[PDB]
Amino acid sequence: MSGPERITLAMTGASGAQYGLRLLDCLVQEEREVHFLISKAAQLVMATQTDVALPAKPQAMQAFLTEYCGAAAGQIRVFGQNDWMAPPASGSSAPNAMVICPCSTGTLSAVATGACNNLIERAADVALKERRPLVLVPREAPFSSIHLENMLKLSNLGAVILPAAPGFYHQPQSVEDLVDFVVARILNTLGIPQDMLPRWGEQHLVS
């Protein structure tokens, strides 16, 4: 397989739960293992703004998502926000790529300053210290200088800042086509195959 075997996928409380769910579904279809983390605010976002009824407790959530995605047994692991026994809490874990999708401005801040107040924050701290892939998908507008300084610091350290800013050059016909644009760019960044967004200019031989 091209790309990582295991992805830590953290959802935080920005608008854009759709991107996180679609990414989870694509990662499952490419037979990757997913370590799934979700914040309390992202639970509120999904509950109040989508019609996905995600159970609260980690075991019930793991069962629901496994069904939602047609995943294989053990393929999706769910860990709670203080579960320091989970692999992402330590750099001695097996290597995983991490994506925070969507990434709230508060989680962006925590990651940039090294705050470790929950497993999502610690898992990012670990990704950075181990030089493992870390992709952040912020969804905010406007971006303040605080936001931008936090993104720049992390980009300078090798994190990928991939805003939830879809393009229109594939002639999107639905919300889903926009969601898929961003998910495709994430998978491209991770080096995981995707067929939602063609390779620009692949057939163009001469100008």
Which chain residues interact with K ion by CB under 5 A? 15, 49, 168-169
Task: Tell me: does residue 203 bind ligand 4LR (CB under 6 A).
Answer: no
Q: For residues 199 and 189, what is the distance between their CA atoms, to the nearest angstrom?
A: 13
Task: Tell me: does residue 82 bind ligand 4LR (CB under 6 A).
Answer: no
Known binding residues for dimethylallyl phosphate: 169, 185
CB-nearest residue to ligand 4LR: 91
When binding is defined by CB under 6 A, the residue of 167, 191, 193, 198 that contacts ligand 4LR is: 167
Q: Which residue, 192, 183, 191, 188, is CA-closest to 200?
A: 188
Q: Residue 75 is encoded by which pair of tokens?
A: 């393929």
Non-local (6+) Cβ contacts of 105 within 8 A are 14, 138, 140, 146, 147, 150
Task: Tell me: does residue 70 bind ligand 4LR (CB under 6 A).
Answer: no
Q: Residue 107's binding partner, choosing from K ion, ligand 4LR, ligand FMN, none, with beta-carbon cut-off 5 to 8 A by kind?
A: ligand FMN
Non-local (6+) Cβ contacts of 143 within 8 A are 151
CA distances from residue 71 to 2, 6, 13, 26 in whole angstroms, order as listed: 19, 14, 24, 10
Task: Tell me: does residue 171 bind a copy of itself (CB under 8 A).
Answer: yes
Task: Tell me: does residue 80 bind a copy of itself (CB under 8 A).
Answer: yes
Task: Tell me: does residue 47 bind a copy of itself (CB under 8 A).
Answer: no
Look up tokens 């629901």; give the residue.
64
Q: Residue 155's binding partner, choosing from ligand FMN, K ion, a copy of itself, none, with beta-carbon cut-off 5 to 8 A by kind?
A: a copy of itself
Q: For residues 47 and 37, what is the distance between their CA atoms, to the nearest angstrom?
A: 16
Over the window 4 to 33, marking each residue x when it contacts a copy of itself by CB under 8 A and - when it does not, the resulting string is ---------x-xxxx---------------
Pair type for strands 33-38 and 134-138: unpaired
DSSP secondary structure letter of residue 94: P
Contacts of ligand 4LR in 134-153 (CB under 6 A):
140
Inter-residue contact 91 to 131 (CB < 8 Å): no
Q: Residue 32's binding partner, choosing from a copy of itself, ligand FMN, K ion, none, with beta-carbon cut-off 5 to 8 A by kind?
A: none
Q: Closest CB to ligand 4LR among 14 and 65?
A: 14
Residues that bind ligand 4LR (CB under 6 A): 15, 84, 89-92, 126, 140, 167, 169, 200
